[PDB]
Scaffold this active site. Structure first.
Site: not given
Ligand SMILES: [Zn+2]
Length: 216
Positions: A94, A167, A51, A129, A122, A59, A163, A53, A8
């Site tokens: 995010h 993750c 990430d 999530e 992901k 989430s 982070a 989304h 990420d």
């Molecule tokens: Zn996320």
């Protein structure tokens, strides 16, 4: 063979302008970029994760009436007939697919594009999530990671990025659980929480799963 997974390194986590900036996140870009290019490391493959989304992702606090960012929430298994639950955090919006926020930071995007590095997305399914790059928090939906790692004969996995406490840790755990010899190079990670104690908590959990943590 050794694979390096870069977790990420995205605008929304690294840029000050991002919506979920990891403190001291920018300090990772160049070192990670060097890491990715370092012959001595003998990376047989490198995979980067994003990430990724949808805007209506479960989430984000924006998608729950009467709940604000960083609140605690209780997720319910999306498996029909499964009634188990997990405690979660609702976040600021995010990494929405195809937004500045979800791009890999330029220095890394450029490396991915010029060297054709595998990307694993992901967080794609609206209804759950994912912290781990391997699979969702239920271990229902898997990603590509494992099959890809296997095609390329990965026996060991090195994990870096952000982070640390979400993750990075979740990805390390998945990898160990799937039987890869797993390593977190701590010097190349940062937590969302800039409480010093957080690095010890994660450090200790990692070691409980026989993941081994080193600095460099
Ligand atoms: Zn996320």
């Amino acid at each position: 063979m050794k694979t390096l997974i870069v977790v990420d390194m995205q605008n929304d986590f690294i840029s000050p302008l991002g919506s979920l900036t990891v403190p001291k996140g920018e300090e990772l870009i160049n070192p990670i970029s060097d890491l990715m290019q370092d012959a001595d490391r003998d990376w047989h493959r490198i995979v980067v994760t994003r990430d990724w989304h949808p805007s209506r992702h479960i989430s984000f606090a924006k998608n729950h009436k009467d709940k604000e960012p960083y609140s605690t929430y209780t997720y319910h298994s999306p498996r029909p007939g499964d009634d188990s639950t997990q405690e979660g955090i609702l976040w600021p919006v995010h990494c929405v697919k195809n937004t500045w926020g979800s791009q890999l930071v330029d220095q890394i995007m450029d490396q991915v594009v010029t060297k054709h590095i595998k990307i694993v997305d992901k967080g794609f399914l609206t209804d759950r999530e994912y912290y781990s790059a391997f699979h969702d928090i239920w271990n229902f939906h898997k990603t590509d990671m494992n099959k890809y790692l296997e095609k390329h004969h990965t026996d060991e996995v090195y994990i870096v990025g952000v982070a640390l406490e979400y993750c990075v840790k979740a990805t390390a755990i998945s990898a160990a659980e799937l039987g890869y010899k797993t390593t977190v190079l701590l010097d190349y990670t940062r937590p969302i929480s800039d409480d010093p104690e957080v690095i010890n908590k994660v450090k200790e959990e990692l070691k409980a799963h026989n993941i081994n943590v080193v600095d460099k």
